[PDB]
Design a protein around this ligand. Structure first.
Ligand SMILES: O[C@H]1[C@H](O)[C@@H](O)[C@H](O)[C@@H](O)[C@H]1O
Ligand SMILES: [Ca+2]
Length: 289
């Protein structure tokens, strides 16, 4: 079990949903960290923005995605033009291998384009196959959570209410992958394709109760039932209290002028900051609420 100074030791025996963290915002960018791996000196929740194409219209290849911020190749601080998604994911895998006993790592995979058809090799299945090939047994997935709470994975949404996630100690050495997109439709498409086999948690844009516990905006009812995480911008952060009530992992981004301690008091699990190292509460970046 690791013990970097930034983790409150009380965290280990706390259910994962009861833990507040400082997270990065876009920390794959060179301007926010010298290397992607260095982020893990400060936090356990990271972010990658991934694109199908080299620019907006051209340059894709099967089984491969690029990592950069703007529409336009690769522009990031991951190991490596061959510093692609796979390279960034391998940076995390390698850090994990070098720190047995680590607090679970959460990676926010912020998808920037749509899914491809089969022939282009960038379907939801292709994505799962990539992340599985890289992380292997390190992943903790929605089916794993569903088994933990005694639910079907397609009924996590509502069956999580009143339940505890595994503790951080139970999740030592694990990696949790989270899918985001500006359009919830792309999450619905991923969940309809992968169902209980999904390697990645979907975390929809959340601006109403239905996005936590009902038919999520932009998704089918079937996809909605897989929701165990919720993603909020600054203006929607009040929804974190309901994510907390439903034992969904809530993330808030864009609220950098509010302190970690204040986000804790707002029941936000993952508080995303550009300047992550500069945030703490009582010297910690990970602590129970
Ligand atoms: O630009 C935002 C921001 O990058 C967030 O960190 C992310 O979770 C979103 O999905 C995105 O649209
Ligand atoms: Ca992003």
């Amino acid at each position: 079990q690791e013990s970097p100074a930034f983790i409150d030791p009380a965290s280990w025996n706390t259910p994962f949903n009861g833990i507040a963290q400082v997270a990065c915002h876009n920390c794959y960018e060179k301007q926010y960290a010298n290397t992607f791996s260095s982020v893990l000196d400060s936090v356990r929740t990271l972010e990658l923005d991934f694109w199908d194409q080299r620019d907006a219209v051209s340059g894709g290849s099967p089984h491969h995605w690029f990592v950069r911020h703007n529409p336009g190749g690769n522009d990031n601080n991951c190991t490596g033009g061959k510093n692609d998604l796979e390279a960034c994911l391998n940076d995390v895998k390698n850090w994990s291998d070098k720190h047995p006993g680590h607090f679970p790592i959460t990676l926010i995979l912020d998808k920037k384009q749509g899914w491809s058809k089969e022939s282009s090799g960038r379907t939801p299945k292709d994505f799962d196959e990539l992340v599985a090939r890289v992380f292997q047994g390190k992943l903790f997935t929605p089916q794993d959570l569903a088994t933990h709470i005694g639910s079907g994975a397609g009924a996590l949404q509502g069956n999580l209410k009143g339940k505890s996630w595994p503790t951080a100690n139970d999740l030592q050495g694990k990696v949790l992958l989270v899918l985001n997109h500006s359009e919830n439709q792309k999450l619905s498409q991923y969940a309809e394709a992968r169902t209980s086999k999904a390697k990645v948690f979907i975390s929809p844009v959340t601006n109403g109760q239905n996005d936590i516990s009902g038919k999520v905006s932009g998704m089918s009812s079937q996809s909605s039932g897989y929701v165990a995480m919720n993603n909020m911008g600054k203006g929607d952060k009040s929804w974190a209290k309901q994510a907390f009530a439903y034992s969904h992992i809530g993330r808030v981004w864009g609220d950098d002028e509010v302190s970690f301690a204040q986000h804790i008091n707002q029941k936000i699990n993952l508080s995303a900051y550009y300047r992550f190292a500069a945030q703490s509460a009582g010297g910690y970046r990970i602590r129970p609420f």
